[PDB]
Design an enzyme around this catalytic site. Structure first.
Site, PDB file in Angstrom:
ATOM      1  N   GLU A   1       8.173 -14.303  -0.720  1.00  0.00           N
ATOM      2  CA  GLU A   1       7.916 -12.855  -0.722  1.00  0.00           C
ATOM      3  C   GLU A   1       8.310 -12.189  -2.045  1.00  0.00           C
ATOM      4  O   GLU A   1       7.533 -11.433  -2.619  1.00  0.00           O
ATOM      5  CB  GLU A   1       8.636 -12.183   0.449  1.00  0.00           C
ATOM      6  CG  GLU A   1       7.982 -12.425   1.813  1.00  0.00           C
ATOM      7  CD  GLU A   1       6.645 -11.723   1.993  1.00  0.00           C
ATOM      8  OE1 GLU A   1       6.015 -11.342   0.991  1.00  0.00           O
ATOM      9  OE2 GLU A   1       6.216 -11.573   3.156  1.00  0.00           O
TER      10      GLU A   1
ATOM     11  N   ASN B   1      -0.064  -2.943  -1.206  1.00  0.00           N
ATOM     12  CA  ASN B   1      -0.996  -3.595  -0.289  1.00  0.00           C
ATOM     13  C   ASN B   1      -2.362  -2.923  -0.336  1.00  0.00           C
ATOM     14  O   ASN B   1      -2.481  -1.750  -0.702  1.00  0.00           O
ATOM     15  CB  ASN B   1      -0.427  -3.572   1.130  1.00  0.00           C
ATOM     16  CG  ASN B   1       0.937  -4.233   1.217  1.00  0.00           C
ATOM     17  OD1 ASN B   1       1.134  -5.352   0.733  1.00  0.00           O
ATOM     18  ND2 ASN B   1       1.887  -3.546   1.827  1.00  0.00           N
TER      19      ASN B   1
ATOM     20  N   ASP C   1      -4.175  -1.733   1.886  1.00  0.00           N
ATOM     21  CA  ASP C   1      -4.289  -0.561   2.757  1.00  0.00           C
ATOM     22  C   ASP C   1      -3.587   0.690   2.209  1.00  0.00           C
ATOM     23  O   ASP C   1      -3.636   1.763   2.828  1.00  0.00           O
ATOM     24  CB  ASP C   1      -3.825  -0.894   4.187  1.00  0.00           C
ATOM     25  CG  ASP C   1      -2.320  -1.103   4.304  1.00  0.00           C
ATOM     26  OD1 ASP C   1      -1.608  -1.132   3.283  1.00  0.00           O
ATOM     27  OD2 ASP C   1      -1.843  -1.247   5.451  1.00  0.00           O
TER      28      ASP C   1
ATOM     29  N   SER D   1      -0.294   0.932   1.642  1.00  0.00           N
ATOM     30  CA  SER D   1       1.134   0.800   1.884  1.00  0.00           C
ATOM     31  C   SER D   1       1.732  -0.045   0.750  1.00  0.00           C
ATOM     32  O   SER D   1       0.997  -0.608  -0.068  1.00  0.00           O
ATOM     33  CB  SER D   1       1.394   0.158   3.245  1.00  0.00           C
ATOM     34  OG  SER D   1       0.950  -1.186   3.259  1.00  0.00           O
TER      35      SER D   1
ATOM     36  N   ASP E   1       5.045  -2.955  -0.115  1.00  0.00           N
ATOM     37  CA  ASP E   1       6.098  -3.855   0.343  1.00  0.00           C
ATOM     38  C   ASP E   1       7.305  -3.711  -0.576  1.00  0.00           C
ATOM     39  O   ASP E   1       7.149  -3.667  -1.792  1.00  0.00           O
ATOM     40  CB  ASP E   1       5.647  -5.313   0.259  1.00  0.00           C
ATOM     41  CG  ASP E   1       4.735  -5.738   1.391  1.00  0.00           C
ATOM     42  OD1 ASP E   1       4.456  -4.960   2.329  1.00  0.00           O
ATOM     43  OD2 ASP E   1       4.293  -6.905   1.330  1.00  0.00           O
TER      44      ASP E   1
ATOM     45  N   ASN F   1       7.254  -3.581   4.685  1.00  0.00           N
ATOM     46  CA  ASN F   1       6.122  -2.722   4.430  1.00  0.00           C
ATOM     47  C   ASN F   1       6.304  -1.270   4.909  1.00  0.00           C
ATOM     48  O   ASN F   1       6.843  -1.024   5.979  1.00  0.00           O
ATOM     49  CB  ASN F   1       4.894  -3.393   5.037  1.00  0.00           C
ATOM     50  CG  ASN F   1       3.925  -2.426   5.566  1.00  0.00           C
ATOM     51  OD1 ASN F   1       2.972  -2.067   4.887  1.00  0.00           O
ATOM     52  ND2 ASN F   1       4.171  -1.954   6.786  1.00  0.00           N
TER      53      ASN F   1
ATOM     54  N   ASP G   1      10.098  -7.738  17.019  1.00  0.00           N
ATOM     55  CA  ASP G   1       8.977  -6.866  17.391  1.00  0.00           C
ATOM     56  C   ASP G   1       7.887  -7.545  18.229  1.00  0.00           C
ATOM     57  O   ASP G   1       6.997  -6.867  18.749  1.00  0.00           O
ATOM     58  CB  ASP G   1       8.370  -6.233  16.126  1.00  0.00           C
ATOM     59  CG  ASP G   1       7.379  -5.128  16.430  1.00  0.00           C
ATOM     60  OD1 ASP G   1       7.782  -4.104  17.025  1.00  0.00           O
ATOM     61  OD2 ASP G   1       6.197  -5.282  16.062  1.00  0.00           O
TER      62      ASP G   1
HETATM   63 CO   LIG Z   1       3.499  -8.265   2.583  1.00  0.00          CO
END
Ligand SMILES: [Co+2]
Ligand SMILES: [Cl-]
Ligand SMILES: [Cl-]
Ligand SMILES: [Cl-]
Ligand SMILES: [Cl-]
Ligand code: NA
Length: 129
Positions: free
Chosen positions: A35, A46, A48, A50, A52, A59, A101
């Protein structure tokens, strides 16, 4: 801060990640490697819109507030900048929420694609912890 491999493993163990939700320490170390390359200051946009943040690339769509992700949530109740600290507490605490989650560590695509099913113990081999 860029952590060394064993330094991060020890910090992750101290903060309660070893075997958290059944995931051995090596899983967490491996996820952070791919990561963020162990860099707490890592940020990546990202597709979209967003972003990270931090050692586990958490995110803004769901987990933290960065003020620039429309329609997003802040389920960890933290500014995303808190995830960039040299102290990994906020990242660990938020990661505990994420892994609980429903989909476990599959929530991190990099974990699924590069760590899942591999010899993750190799990531903590030789470390004093
Ligand atoms: Co990510
Ligand atoms: Cl390494
Ligand atoms: Cl392990
Ligand atoms: Cl936002
Ligand atoms: Cl699971
Ligand atoms: Na958000």
């Amino acid at each position: 801060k860029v952590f060394g491999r064993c330094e991060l493993a020890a910090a992750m163990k101290r903060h309660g990640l070893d075997n958290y939700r059944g995931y051995s320490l090596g899983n967490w170390v491996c996820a952070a490697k791919f990561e963020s390359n162990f860099n707490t200051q890592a940020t990546n946009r990202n597709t979209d819109g967003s972003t990270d943040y931090g050692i586990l690339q958490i995110n803004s769509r769901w987990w933290c507030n960065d003020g620039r992700t429309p329609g997003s949530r802040n389920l960890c109740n933290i500014p995303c900048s808190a995830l960039l600290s040299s102290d990994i507490t906020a990242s660990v605490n938020c990661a505990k929420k994420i892994v609980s989650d429903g989909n476990g560590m599959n929530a991190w695509v990099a974990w699924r694609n590069r760590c899942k099913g591999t010899d993750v113990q190799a990531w903590i081999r030789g470390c004093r912890l």
